[PDB]
Amino acid sequence: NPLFEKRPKNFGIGQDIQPKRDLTRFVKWPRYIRLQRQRAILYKRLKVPPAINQFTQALDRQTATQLLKLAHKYRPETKQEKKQRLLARAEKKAAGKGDVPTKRPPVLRAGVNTVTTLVENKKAQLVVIAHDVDPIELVVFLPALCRKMGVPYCIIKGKARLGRLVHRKTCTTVAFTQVNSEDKGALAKLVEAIRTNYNDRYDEIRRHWGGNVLGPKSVARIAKLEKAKAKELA
Amino acid sequence: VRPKVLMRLSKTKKHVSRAYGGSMCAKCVRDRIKRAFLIEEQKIVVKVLKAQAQSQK
């Protein structure tokens, strides 16, 4: 109330000092940041071939969650219940002389070769490809192979997100092979939607030449160059 | 005396009672008073002169 001033500093030039401002863009990062920061840029400068920008044409956010709840219930046997199954049924089949209390276990397969055999022999029905396997060689033969075989495939985001339905770090590929009773009706409701983007437009995905995008500093330079060149035209 | 001697002496045998005690030559003190006063008056005069420049112009 009585005697409190306000002292306004003027933060201009050659006077009252500067504050502790943002300083995120202007900091000397270590060498491992500036590599991994320029590297994401470097895809966006060079013209990528169409065989590797199949990634970033990804399955959208609504569909993949519908696909993950589908993939959550063919989760393979973890080693605690792999332990528990073998210890259980061996005693059950010895007490009741159980010849087959198991008909067939349906599960998705994990790994590339466990997928690539099943795609070459038409043995799987939906193929889920991770986004981020950094040796990209492990990918660019898949979307032409599922094209020539006719098994529908989807490019999805998160190599760890494929790992969470397999109890492993990265998983790269999951092939839905033996569908359940209550789940084939779930499957064809998706494979319609997955052919709708990928398989039908294979002549379009064959010629996506991404990249060749400059920096917004030089892009704003050409946009200002349009204005004066439009001032030639006006 | 020598700088390493100066830990021994008392804190009257090392300075003068004035403000800017052992550092300014007592003529520069009574010139830093006159200079810091006469410039700060000119801050106020120009601020209210240029307030009047923002008034009638």
Add this chain to the structure above:
Amino acid sequence: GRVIRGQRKGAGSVFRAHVKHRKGAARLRAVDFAERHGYIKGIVKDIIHDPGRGAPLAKVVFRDPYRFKKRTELFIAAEGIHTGQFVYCGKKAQLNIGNVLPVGTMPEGTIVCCLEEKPGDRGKLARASGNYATVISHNPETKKTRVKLPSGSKKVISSANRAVVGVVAGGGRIDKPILKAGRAYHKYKAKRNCWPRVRGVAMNPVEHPFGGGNHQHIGKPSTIRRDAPAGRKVGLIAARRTGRLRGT
């Protein structure tokens, strides 16, 4: 043969610069925010003799706009400055002696010194005692600038670089005949051992390509081109003309 004198310079064995008592290098302010959008206030504390240089050497105080700290930097003492001047440096610095400011904001005809080759290298051209470049013939677009360096060859430089206005003090130093060997000797004793001008004729066959012979004469034509190997580029290196000058 033996290794000649001019080849022996390149190891830096006894030919390194006598560099202990030198008082610091002579550069400008590194280009920061304040100088590119305004000017900043600075006071010349005192001006010192930097031995190995005949120019006097200024020492300007400042205030750091980001940390509470005063910074002491070393300009080149251009002519006419005295201790206690308010050198005001930046882009919109008002054109006086000592106020370093870019060449695109001075008019053509401005006699400057310590201007820069390409912007942000802190002062390279026309630094020695009594030299001056003069900005002429601006280019409005394509931000460039013709400058007459103290040779006469109009270099065109990028126009974001700054030049302390005025000539370097120590103008007309060399007008004293040194006139005795000791004063020749002391000048180069503070610099470096570049003094022994022992002529290539007086020395032997081995140690210079001129020497030998029973009479002190060269015999070999002294115009040796720049297609020469090292330890052969002696005499007048690739001279496009020779003899005493005439007119220009």
Add this chain to the structure above:
Amino acid sequence: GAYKYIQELWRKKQSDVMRFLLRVRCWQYRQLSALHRAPRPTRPDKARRLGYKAKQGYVIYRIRVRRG
């Protein structure tokens, strides 16, 4: 299944799909130091037919030499 396809895609190392992947990885390594650890082999076929079994004990040191 796929180690034949990795072999054949890395075989033709002059086509567009691979000449990008070779040229970026040639940029990728040159900014790193002289000797360091790639955590896992970047040609997982080619390490495997030389003796790499992907378990503990086996390290990859990506290493750089000057031509000429």
Add this chain to the structure above:
Amino acid sequence: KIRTSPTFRRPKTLRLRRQPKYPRKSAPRRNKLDHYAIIKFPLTTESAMKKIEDNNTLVFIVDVKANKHQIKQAVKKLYDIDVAKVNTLIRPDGEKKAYVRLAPDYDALDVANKIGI
């Protein structure tokens, strides 16, 4: 998380105190430099008895790895006599002759009898 310093300095991360699982030489390597191997000879010469009459100053020969503190510890712990100061020299035949002046109480003559010199 607004980093107002234009350097990326190294983050202070956790550091563990060393905890070994097992000893690494099974036993403490005992001190072989006890209060017996320090003080070898008491000196008996002409000058080093003239010290003992008129100066209250016992004279010893001490191993060179000892110092002025351990001589004062060894002379008390063997002879029950106090030490005022020690004055050591590396003698130029190799040993460390150590002049020990005792307290003003204890007598240089009676102690000289009891060690025998």
Add this chain to the structure above:
RNA sequence: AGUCGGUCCUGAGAGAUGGGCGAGCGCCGUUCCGAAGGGACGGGCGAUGGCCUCCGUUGCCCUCGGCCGAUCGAAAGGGAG
């Protein structure tokens, strides 16, 4: 021998890691292509032990700490008595 000196400090220079080069023992190099501070007082919580009043010891957390690079280099320079 605390007070005589070496020790300590930097000078011209000599010298490792980072990095570069090299068939190679290694050389170049001294702030250069660098995640090169392990310290702080104070706030905070958490533990701990004394006389659990209050102190004392760490755990981590908010804040500063140009680290202008290690380290050697004078028995005539600097250096308390």
Add this chain to the structure above:
RNA sequence: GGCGGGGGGGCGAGCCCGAGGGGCUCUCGCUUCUGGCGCCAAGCGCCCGCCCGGCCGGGCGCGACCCGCUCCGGGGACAGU
């Protein structure tokens, strides 16, 4: 260590129509008579256990505008190797 874009601003004449008003299109910005000082926030808007509508210590925002793909300039498919 404040870069380029987009917003802020009449204490601006700009460049025009035109009645308040319109931004067609610009200007850049809050330091020049003096050998002074300057940092570690004032002030506001808020949410807390506090005392019946009070009292003590804390937290955030704004004060210090939004977004963005290279630290900023300088070259450039040449130089170089």
